[PDB]
Design an enzyme around this catalytic site. Structure first.
Site, short mmCIF file in Angstrom:
data_model
loop_
_atom_site.label_atom_id
_atom_site.label_comp_id
_atom_site.label_asym_id
_atom_site.label_seq_id
_atom_site.Cartn_x
_atom_site.Cartn_y
_atom_site.Cartn_z
N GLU A 12 -48.67 -14.37 -1.36
CA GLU A 12 -49.98 -13.50 -1.71
C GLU A 12 -50.37 -12.97 -0.05
OE1 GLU A 12 -52.89 -14.82 -4.04
OE2 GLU A 12 -52.14 -16.43 -4.93
N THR A 17 -45.69 -5.69 -0.78
CA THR A 17 -46.21 -4.90 -0.47
C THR A 17 -45.97 -3.92 -0.22
OG1 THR A 17 -48.05 -6.01 -1.53
CG2 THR A 17 -48.16 -3.87 0.36
N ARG A 140 -50.11 -6.43 -8.21
CA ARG A 140 -49.72 -7.63 -7.94
C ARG A 140 -48.66 -7.70 -9.39
NH1 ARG A 140 -48.61 -11.56 -4.99
NH2 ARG A 140 -49.09 -14.32 -5.60
N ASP A 162 -36.61 -10.30 0.31
CA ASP A 162 -37.79 -10.01 0.08
C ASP A 162 -37.89 -11.96 -0.76
OD1 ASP A 162 -40.58 -9.93 -0.03
OD2 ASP A 162 -40.25 -8.55 -2.22
N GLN A 166 -44.66 -19.38 -2.00
CA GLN A 166 -45.09 -20.57 -2.61
C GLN A 166 -44.42 -21.52 -2.55
OE1 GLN A 166 -45.76 -18.04 -4.64
NE2 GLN A 166 -47.33 -17.45 -4.72
#
Ligand SMILES: Nc1nc2c(ncn2[C@@H]2O[C@H](COP(=O)(O)OP(=O)(O)O)[C@@H](O)[C@H]2O)c(=O)[nH]1
Ligand code: ALF
Ligand SMILES: [Mg+2]
Lengths: 310, 132
Positions: A12, A17, A140, A162, A166
């Protein structure tokens, strides 16, 4: 004239993005038909967002401002866009107690775009609603694995990778790590008072620091341009007023102002560099959902890559 | 044998894609190229676990936990702390629905991220177009 580019950072932090901005700036925009495919995502985000706040209320034992909202909350769970569901969401969102729980979002897990969407419900809930480009950028979707994209800029052919995110995804990063020209390492500035979704005991910014220490100083990247995007600066600017940086840095002696606290974070990351003699970190404060700002920053980054592989 | 219509129906839903063993293989291949195959391998391990017999569930549960759920699993699935903790508690006295929670989250993750991309990939498009 190939450029192997890695988008890395913790869960996140904004990597996907930036990838979206690369499609917009270099591959010409999101069409109306493409935007309409993101409607379901925007709805899913909005819905899972108000649900997260309401469930927090149960666990944190926060009352509703008005107890008629109890039936709205029940309806929300059964329903979960209709006009009925819209009205349920609007009424919950405007309620004093749901708002109270919202301002305490650091105690649970909430999407950063919650407010953006929930404050524009009138627009989003219209039958003929077409997501704007910004609505798409604010969506998201958890990335798992490694995804390769191509684009050409200033006559350079970017092979862009990309990744997730986590802890669980990071073991997979090694498979990208060969022959890397540049790394954009993303950090969520606003994560300074949050906790890992995968580990409630670890401060998100402390994680990001430890991860950057590992990447920056990795021997595979000795000849790699390390770029640091201190991202979500807009969210940070709003948050530093409300929530002290000492939650993350107990030794921080300075003021809770956007510019000082931003500078401190920068220096905390830049000090992790253990080769200050041979290697430079190229730091930019970014807002990944701001196309203009990513276009300016990416132009600078590309010039740094030209100068470093010349 | 495998049809064309059949492959087009894979764009309807992830459930339709994973309904049959052919689609599983093809989507599996796609996930392998994106380094996320552990998600489907986990989903398949849960499916077998459900059909597994009352008697042998303790071992099957421990095996799947170690292989996919635990912090140090080699094929560790991307799930949050609360989900991993509640799975952990269920491994001790496991019932047939033990992994439903984690299965749902990995389905949703495959469904929302990997699957939309699958539908736009060479693997799928080359399969679809070569049958027409
Ligand atoms: N306001 C704001 N939102 C951001 C920024 N960067 C990312 N986001 C949002 O935060 C969410 C997570 O972003 P994402 O790119 O998926 O993070 P990833 O896990 O690193 O790929 C998305 O909804 C984005 O729209 C930022 O600089 N400002
Ligand atoms: F939380 Al992420 F990509 F790193 F979805
Ligand atoms: Mg991502």
């Amino acid at each position: 004239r190939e450029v192997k580019l890695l988008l890395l950072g913790a869960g996140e932090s904004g990597k996907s993005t930036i990838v979206k901005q690369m499609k917009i700036i270099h591959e010409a925009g999101y069409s109306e038909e493409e935007c309409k495919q993101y409607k379901a995502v925007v709805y899913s985000n909005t819905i899972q967002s108000i649900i997260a706040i309401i469930r927090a209320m149960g666990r944190l034992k926060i009352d509703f401002g008005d107890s008629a909202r109890a039936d709205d909350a029940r309806q929300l769970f059964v329903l979960a866009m209709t006009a009925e569901l819209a009205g349920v969401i609007k009424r919950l969102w405007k309620d004093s107690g749901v708002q109270a729980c919202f301002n305490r979002s650091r105690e649970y897990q909430l999407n950063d775009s919650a407010a953006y969407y929930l404050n524009d419900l009138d627009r989003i809930a219209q039958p003929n609603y077409i997501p704007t480009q910004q609505d798409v950028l604010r969506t998201r979707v958890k990335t798992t694995g490694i995804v390769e994209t191509h684009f050409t800029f200033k006559d350079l052919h970017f092979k862009m990778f990309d990744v997730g995110g986590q802890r669980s995804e990071r073991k997979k990063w090694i498979h990208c790590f060969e022959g890397v020209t540049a790394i954009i390492f993303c950090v969520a500035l606003s994560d300074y008072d949050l906790v890992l979704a995968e580990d409630e005991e670890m401060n998100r910014m402390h994680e990001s620091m430890k991860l950057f220490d590992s990447i920056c100083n990795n021997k595979w990247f000795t000849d790699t341009s390390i770029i640091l995007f201190l991202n979500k600066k807009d969210l940070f600017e709003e948050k530093i007023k409300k929530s002290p940086l000492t939650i993350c840095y107990p030794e921080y002696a300075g003021s809770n102002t956007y510019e000082e606290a931003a500078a401190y974070i920068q220096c905390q990351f830049e000090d992790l560099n253990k080769r200050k003699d041979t290697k430079e970190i190229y730091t930019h404060f970014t807002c990944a959902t701001d196309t203009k700002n990513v276009q300016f920053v990416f132009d600078a980054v590309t010039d740094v890559i030209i100068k470093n592989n010349l | 044998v495998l049809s064309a219509a059949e492959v087009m129906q894979w764009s309807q839903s992830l459930e339709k894609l994973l309904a049959n063993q052919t689609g599983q293989n093809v989507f599996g291949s796609f996930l392998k190229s994106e380094f996320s195959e552990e998600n489907i391998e986990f989903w398949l391990a849960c499916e077998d676990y459900k059909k597994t017999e009352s008697d042998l569930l303790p071992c099957k549960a421990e095996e799947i936990y170690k292989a996919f759920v635990h912090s140090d699993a080699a094929k560790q699935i991307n799930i949050d702390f609360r989900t991993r903790e509640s799975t952990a508690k269920k491994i001790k006295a496991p019932t047939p629905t033990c992994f439903d929670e984690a299965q749902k989250v990995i389905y949703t993750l495959m469904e929302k991220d990997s699957y939309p991309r699958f539908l736009k990939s060479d693997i799928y498009l080359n399969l679809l177009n070569d049958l027409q």
